[PDB]
Amino acid sequence: ILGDITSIPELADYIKVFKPKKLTLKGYKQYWCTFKDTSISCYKSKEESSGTPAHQMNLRGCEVTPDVNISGQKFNIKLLIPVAEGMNEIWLRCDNEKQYAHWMAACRLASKGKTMADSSYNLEVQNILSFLKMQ
């Protein structure tokens, strides 16, 4: 208290999420998403984020893979998430380098059971940004 979302810290932003499903045509859908503790919640809009998420995932133990091309302005994150009887595959698509650095760093820490309050959070964010530049 005496703080906002950055005091926690958490993320809350518009993120595109591609979640393929059997016999279903799916794409990168824009959701209003939060990153809290080790979990991502996806909502249809900011206006519907008090209710049940359109998607929710706890990233503990997940595999996080960068899918980046700077020239193409492609800032994607692939997630493979272990569930009680299976693994779940999701792609996050970010709008720019800074959004990508923050979400990708959050995913990596969450995979390892860490929240963004961990000292390694800003290590991951800044080093991602450092390597998104051109020589």
Swiss-Prot record:
Domain spans labelled PH: 16-112
Sequence positions that bind a 1,2-diacyl-sn-glycero-3-phospho-(1D-myo-inositol-3,4,5-trisphosphate): 19
Domain of life assignment: Eukaryota
Subcellular location: Cytoplasm; Cytoplasm, Cell cortex; Cytoplasm, Cytoskeleton; Cytoplasm, Cytoskeleton, Stress fiber
Phenotypic consequence of residue 21 to A: Reduces integrin activation
Stimuli inducing this protein: By serum in lung fetal fibroblast cultured cells.
Tissue expression notes: Ubiquitous. Found in numerous tumor tissues.
Family: Belongs to the kindlin family.
Comment text on domains: The FERM domain is not correctly detected by PROSITE or Pfam techniques because it contains the insertion of a PH domain. The PH domain binds phospholipids. Binds preferentially phosphatidylinositol-3,4,5-trisphosphate, and has lower affinity for phosphatidylinositol-4,5-bisphosphate.
Subunit annotation: Interacts with ILK. Interacts with FBLIM1. Interacts with ITGB1 and ITGB3. Interacts with active, unphosphorylated CTNNB1. Identified in a complex with CTNNB1 and TCF7L2/TCF4. Interacts with ITGB1; the interaction is inhibited in presence of ITGB1BP1.
Record's function text: Scaffolding protein that enhances integrin activation mediated by TLN1 and/or TLN2, but activates integrins only weakly by itself. Binds to membranes enriched in phosphoinositides. Enhances integrin-mediated cell adhesion onto the extracellular matrix and cell spreading; this requires both its ability to interact with integrins and with phospholipid membranes. Required for the assembly of focal adhesions. Participates in the connection between extracellular matrix adhesion sites and the actin cytoskeleton and also in the orchestration of actin assembly and cell shape modulation.
Name by which UniProt lists this protein: Fermitin family homolog 2
Source organism of the structure: Homo sapiens (Human)
Whole sequence portion shown: 365 to 499 of 680
